[PDB]
Design a protein around this ligand. Structure first.
Ligand SMILES: Nc1ncnc2c1ncn2[C@@H]1O[C@H](COP(=O)(O)OP(=O)(O)OP(=O)(O)O)[C@@H](O)[C@H]1O
Ligand SMILES: Nc1ncnc2c1ncn2[C@@H]1O[C@H](COP(=O)(O)OP(=O)(O)OP(=O)(O)O)[C@@H](O)[C@H]1O
Ligand SMILES: [Mg+2]
Ligand SMILES: [Mg+2]
Lengths: 585, 563
């Protein structure tokens, strides 16, 4: 869509205002290289005419040699500066673009990060942002040099010949035309190139994370064909992107190589008398021929470079399409909440016709009406897939909701995310350990915690009994996806996190998952004690033990169809008693 | 530098196009140099001839030379880019499948030595960088050198002193300048390869764990560490730019040196005659134009420092020896499987204690066995010994009274069905998440087993076509548990190892699934690890493991009597 491309180019160009001083210096330095090229050509042409035509011995020519040497040194110095000045323009912009993206990934949450594979986020942050460098470093300064330097060259040739100057401008207008018709599809070709790379990178890391399942079912031969297909789609996109660059560069070299030929042919013929129109009614000099022949490649250099860096701009437009979409899509809440509750006392949760929706838009939990007074603890009970973990993901600010869900009378949309999360700690379902060591994971809430308070969490969550089994004790690395630990051993490390920092709201999503009948009792007596210190909501399936929790919410198909205390519900029949009936057999 | 030898052998499978992309590079440079060299002499020779020497001086042959060299320059460069890039990106294909082929043979323990985000860097990013070896490290070097020889030999007819002077400046530059910048940029290329893989690891770990890091306020303090890697990464990118800037400056200064020397030296005389005539412009324009042969060589050895660093990373991965090997002896999959274990002991890598200490049980074909025990007592370590995840140490596992190490891998996978404790939901579709086991099943078979396990609402809307995992619909904890049961049910292997299959399911669904497993797994050997004492009266034996060793063994009725 050509309308989308202009939106991306407006977005790309807005990000270059950080390094405006860098781009302006490079434009100036590129223009100075234009003057130094003309000065170098004039001295070399003047020297050659003196030695060949007028036959002065070299011992007389020292001023033109000295000035030519000085021009070469100035040429090299400006080249050295312009390369470094160009890089700083690209680096500071790329560092700022990446910061904006990482800022929105902090606010996105797990629900919005799961909308793209983790290997496809990585290529969005690494490859797609790093591939806008040549758009800022090299292309933006070149648009001015593509107009200034070629005109500067030709003005220096009109005094010599008006025809040799017309030869360059004779072939010049075709170059901008062919650069655009060839590159009309170069931005979409790059967009599909980064789409195939993101698909290949996300596909690989998905098979790498689940490579244990692949080994179990013997998918060694099948997954090599899937990588071969993903890597071949990517190869054909890359060759499609590259073929435009080779075609565009070949066309621009065709006119550059043609123009040098005519300048050589026209001057070579003029000296022989077959042509007379070019010169200003005066004999053609050898210096004029050499000046226009040395400057013929340099008239198109600023134009060949623009064509070279034009496809660097198309690489940035293709790389910015997936970026701008991520920036465009709203997160779990329309506007970043700024309100924050003050007291650290237990919060009150109040729902009124609450609907919880996925990032795509599917409703996960139906109309939820409930009230949880401050300090009270509730239990979520129901069938699998009935929206119990969705409610706990809404209370954490991970999911967008439609109705009303007020914390201490404040809508959860309006609460400041960073401030709200400091009053909330919970154990997720299938919990993960992001840190390196086992101590680093238990101390995630506050790394600088006293050894006594670290020990209390380890003892409470029954983590201290298997510490001798570990080689480094509590400092042993847990590995990638907690491979060093068992499922039940990693579960108790997750429980240790939630009990270390007291908070206003404690959520629990099957906190005793994959624990035997004994280690579960050790954990539940810690969580039963920890559930009385603040407002608590626990999603469990051990219907038998919970004879003291303040209220039970039996959830079915996204709706709380039965709320009450365990005493009456166990004897009132209905969904809870039947659900408990299949238990305890 | 010697690490590139395994990858220079891949040049052989495309030796025709890769060598053609070098011949066309020499042809382009010879035509590019010839165009300026011939044009420069043509003007000077024409100027000396003047109007009087119109007929004597042949002005048609040089006029065709500049036109012919202008088309060879543009046509040659276009094709040498097409040929060299087309062949380079097909060598890149084999390099990526060959690298990926090594990951699964060393899955459970070999892959634990690496971090997943840094392995994603090697296969996807480091392979691409190592592929730069021919395009910009080899083709520029040998293409330039041949052009140096041809230009020097060609000019040697005119004058020996001038030819080796221009050749000496050019050939000396080619041999001692790239190594000088390689030694200068070798350290930067190692830091630039190391930090790109470090940032990708710290980013994917930061993104994947964003649920916990957000709740406990570690997102900002882990992003700060992530940002510090980028700062170092950007400095390595900056130091590379300093070398690129300085490399171009020196070539332009060396570019000046020959032009000045040719101007000065050729003035004295070309060919032994004091009046060179037009021959002065022949050497000056050759020196002015022949440097574009040394243009790609400038940064070639700055690519080399980063290519070698990548070559080390892939050579590290592809040279790992998997600790589990399989014979090539084809065998037919049995229909009934009974396994015996006798004093099987296993120590995990880089550990001192033993995860398994003398497990010994004999499971007859058709028996259903329940394994109980505390958490961390070796239950899921046992079930991976049966899968040949690792090799037991001074122990023995036999399938059907034959060693488990004597089974072909293709036949081993068909004799065992596993429900892992940690189910994985792949990014693929619902159909493709179930075609891992029984690839030949039809969509009716897939849709049938989905309703059997209770996932009838996965067939709603898109259904089988619907995308799952990251980038699609995510499944709940109980739905992921019943998707792994649907995979094992489709596999239909004689021996079935269930690792707490009814974990995270409520009372009603668990009974609904356990009843389903009772009829589906009938006449099949089942080793079902559980933590729930409910419904064990249907099991022939009960195993109670404590600290990696079997404590009690017998029928549920027997175990209750003995307390
Ligand atoms: N990759 C590994 N490297 C070293 N040790 C490990 C590794 N994986 C597990 N262990 C150790 O092996 C012991 C038992 O492992 P295993 O996973 O078999 O226990 P488990 O019975 O499955 O636990 P659960 O019942 O909670 O699932 C644990 O104490 C753990 O520390
Ligand atoms: N990202 C998503 N997109 C679409 N549907 C989803 C998504 N996440 C969850 N669901 C659906 O929401 C339903 C209930 O989700 P939820 O996990 O809250 O239920 P649950 O009671 O926690 O399940 P379990 O008890 O198995 O953990 C499931 O059927 C699931 O398919
Ligand atoms: Mg859940
Ligand atoms: Mg286990």
């Amino acid at each position: 869509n050509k309308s989308r491309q202009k939106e991306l180019t407006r977005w790309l160009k807005q990000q270059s205002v950080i390094s405006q001083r860098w781009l302006n210096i490079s434009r100036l330095l590129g223009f100075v290289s234009g003057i130094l090229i003309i000065a170098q050509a004039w001295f070399m042409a003047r020297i050659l005419q003196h030695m060949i035509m007028e036959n002065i011995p070299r011992e007389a020519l020292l001023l033109p040699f000295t000035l030519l040497v000085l021009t070469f040194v100035l040429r090299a110095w400006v080249v050295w500066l312009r390369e470094r000045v160009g890089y700083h323009a690209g680096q500071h912009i790329r560092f700022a673009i990446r910061r904006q993206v990482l800022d929105r990934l902090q606010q996105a949450g797990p629900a919005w990060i799961q909308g793209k594979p983790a290997g496809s986020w990585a290529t969005l942050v690494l490859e797609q942002i790093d591939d806008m460098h040549d758009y800022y470093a090299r292309y933006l300064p070149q648009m001015a040099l593509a107009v200034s330097v070629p005109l500067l060259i030709v003005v220096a040739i009109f005094p010599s010949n008006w025809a040799a100057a017309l030869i360059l401008l004779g072939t010049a207008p075709l170059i901008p035309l062919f650069m655009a018709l060839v590159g009309m599809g170069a931005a979409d070709a790059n967009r599909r190139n980064f789409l195939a790379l993101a698909r290949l990178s996300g596909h690989f890391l998905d098979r790498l994370r689940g490579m244990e399942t692949l080994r179990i079912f013997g998918r060694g031969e099948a997954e090599i064909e899937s990588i071969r297909s993903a890597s071949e789609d990517f190869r054909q996109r890359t060759m499609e992107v590259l073929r435009l660059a080779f075609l565009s560069s070949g066309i621009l070299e065709f006119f550059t190589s043609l123009s040098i030929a005519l300048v050589a042919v026209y001057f070579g013929f003029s000296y022989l008398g077959e042509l007379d129109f070019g010169h200003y009614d005066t004999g053609v000099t050898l210096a004029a021929g050499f000046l226009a022949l040395i400057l013929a490649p340099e008239f198109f250099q600023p134009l060949r470079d623009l064509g070279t860096f034009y496809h660097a701009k198309a690489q940035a437009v293709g790389a910015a399409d997936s970026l701008k979409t991520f920036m465009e899509t709203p997160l779990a809440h329309p506007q970043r909440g700024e309100a924050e509750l003050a007291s650290t006392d237990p919060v009150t949760i109040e729902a009124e016709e609450l609907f919880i929706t996925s990032p795509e838009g599917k409703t996960l939990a139906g109309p939820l009406n409930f009230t949880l007074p401050a300090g009270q603890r509730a239990v979520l009970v129901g069938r699998s897939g009935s929206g119990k973990s969705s409610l706990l993901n809404a209370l954490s600010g991970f999911l967008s909701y439609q109705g009303s869900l007020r914390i201490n009378g404040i809508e959860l949309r309006d609460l400041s995310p960073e401030s709200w999360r400091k009053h909330l700690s919970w154990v997720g379902q299938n919990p993960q350990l992001p840190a390196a060591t086992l101590r680093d994971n238990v101390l995630l809430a506050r790394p600088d915690a006293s050894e006594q308070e670290l020990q209390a969490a380890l003892d409470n969550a029954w983590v201290s009994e298997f510490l001798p089994l570990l080689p480094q004790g509590v400092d042993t690395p847990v590995g990638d996806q907690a491979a060093r630990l068992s499922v039940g051993q990693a579960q108790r490390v997750a429980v240790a996190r939630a009990l270390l920092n007291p908070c206003s709201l404690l959520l629990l999503d099957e906190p005793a998952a994959s624990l035997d009948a004994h280690s579960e009792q050790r954990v539940m007596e810690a969580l039963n004690a920890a559930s009385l210190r603040q407002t608590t909501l626990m999603v469990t399936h051990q219907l038998e033990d919970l004879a003291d929790w303040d209220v039970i919410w039996v959830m079915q198909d996204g709706r709380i169809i039965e709320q009450g205390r365990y005493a009456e519900l166990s004897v009132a029949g209905g969904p809870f008693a039947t659900l408990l009936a299949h238990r305890q057999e | 530098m010697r690490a590139l030898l395994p990858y220079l052998a891949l040049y052989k499978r495309h030796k025709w196009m890769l060598s053609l992309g070098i011949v066309l590079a020499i042809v382009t440079l010879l035509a590019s140099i010839g165009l300026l060299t011939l044009s420069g002499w043509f003007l000077s020779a024409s100027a000396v001839a003047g109007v009087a020497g119109l007929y004597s001086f042949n002005y048609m042959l040089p006029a065709a030379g500049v036109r012919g060299a202008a088309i060879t320059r543009t046509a040659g460069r276009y094709f040498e880019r097409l040929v060299s890039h087309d062949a380079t990106f097909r060598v890149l294909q084999h390099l990526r499948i060959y690298t990926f082929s090594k990951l699964l043979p060393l899955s459970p323990a070999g892959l634990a030595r690496y971090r997943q985000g840094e392995l994603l860097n090697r296969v996807v990013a480091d392979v691409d960088t190592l592929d730069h070896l021919y395009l910009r490290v080899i083709s520029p070097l040998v293409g330039a050198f041949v052009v140096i020889m041809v230009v020097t030999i060609g000019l040697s007819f005119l004058d020996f002193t001038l030819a080796f002077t221009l050749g000496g400046i050019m050939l000396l530059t080619l041999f001692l300048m790239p190594p000088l910048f390689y030694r200068a940029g070798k350290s930067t290329g190692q830091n630039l390869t190391h930090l790109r893989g470090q940032y990708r690891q710290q980013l994917t770990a930061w993104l994947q764990g964003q649920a916990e890091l957000t709740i406990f306020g570690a997102s900002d303090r882990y992003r700060t560490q992530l940002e510090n890697t980028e700062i170092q990464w950007l400095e390595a990118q900056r130091r590379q730019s300093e070398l690129t800037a300085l490399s171009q400056a020196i070539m332009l200064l060396i570019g000046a040196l020959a032009v000045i020397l040719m101007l000065w030296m050729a003035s004295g005389g070309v060919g032994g005659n004091a009046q060179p005539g037009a021959l002065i412009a022949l050497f000056v324009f050759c020196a002015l134009a022949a440097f574009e042969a040394l243009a790609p060589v400038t940064g070639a050895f700055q690519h080399l420092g980063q290519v070698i660093a990548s070559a080390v990373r892939i050579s590290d991965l592809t040279d790992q020896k998997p600790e589990v090997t399989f014979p090539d002896t084809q065998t037919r999959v049995a229909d009934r499987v009974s396994l015996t274990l006798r004093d099987v002991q296993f120590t995990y890598p880089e550990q001192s204690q033993q995860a398994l200490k003398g497990i010994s049980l004999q499971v007859n074909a058709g028996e259903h066995i329940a394994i109980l025990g505390r958490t961390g007592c070796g239950k899921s370590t046992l079930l991976q010994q049966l899968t040949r995840a690792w090799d037991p140490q001074q122990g023995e596992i036999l399938l059907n009274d034959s060693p488990i190490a004597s089974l072909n891998e293709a036949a081993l996978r068909q004799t065992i069905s596993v429900v892992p404790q940690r189910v994985h939901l792949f990014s693929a579709t619902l159909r493709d998440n179930l075609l891992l086991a029984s690839p030949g099943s039809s969509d009716e078979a897939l849709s049938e087993i989905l309703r059997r396990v209770g996932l009838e609402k996965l067939l709603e809307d898109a259904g089988l076509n619907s995308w799952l995992g990251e980038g699609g619909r995510q499944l709940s904890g109980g739905e992921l548990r019943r998707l792994a049961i649907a995979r094992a049910l489709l596999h239909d292997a004689p021996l079935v190892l269930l690792d707490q299959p009814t974990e995270g399911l409520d009372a009603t669904t668990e009974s609904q699934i356990l009843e389903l497993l009772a009829e589906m797994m009938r006449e099949k050997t089942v080793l079902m690890v559980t933590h729930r004492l409910r419904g064990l009266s249907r099991f022939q034996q009960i195993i109670v493991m404590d600290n990696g060793q079997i404590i009690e063994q017998g029928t549920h009725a027997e175990l209750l009597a003995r307390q």
